[PDB]
Amino acid sequence: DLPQGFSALEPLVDLPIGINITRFQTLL
Amino acid sequence: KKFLPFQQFGRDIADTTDAVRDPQTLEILDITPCSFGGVSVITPGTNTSN
Ligand SMILES: *[C@@H]1O[C@H](CO)[C@@H](O)[C@H](O)[C@H]1NC(C)=O
């Protein structure tokens, strides 16, 4: 049900952490 | 310019920087190149006058 439209995301956080990633989870 | 809180500088299409966020005071300033113009010289012949 994702609403039809356009809106540009703004960079809010920069993490200089250098971490290797390939998977993720969401916290309800 | 309505510079967003993250934006550091803006450009002319020639890549030359148009405007900058100052690093000591968070003001956003335009950088215009210093004043210039072509110098046409209009003269009679040096046969007639200098
Ligand atoms: C640098 O120093 C001035 C004078 O103390 C201060 O007003 C200004 O906020 C400082 N700039 C930054 C980016 O912290």
Side-chain angles (χ1 to χ4, degrees), chain A residues 10-11, chain B residues 4 6:
Chain A
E10 294 163 39
Chain B
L4 302 183
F6 62 88

Side-chain angles (χ1 to χ4, degrees), chain B residues 22-26:
Chain B
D22 169 317
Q24 302 200 320
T25 312
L26 300 177

Side-chain angles (χ1 to χ4, degrees), chain A residues 4-26:
Chain A
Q4 286 164 351
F6 178 94
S7 43
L9 286 71
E10 294 163 39
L12 297 194
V13 189
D14 178 1
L15 297 184
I17 60 171
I19 301 306
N20 192 31
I21 296 165
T22 65
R23 209 177 268 267
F24 88 102
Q25 284 173 12
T26 306

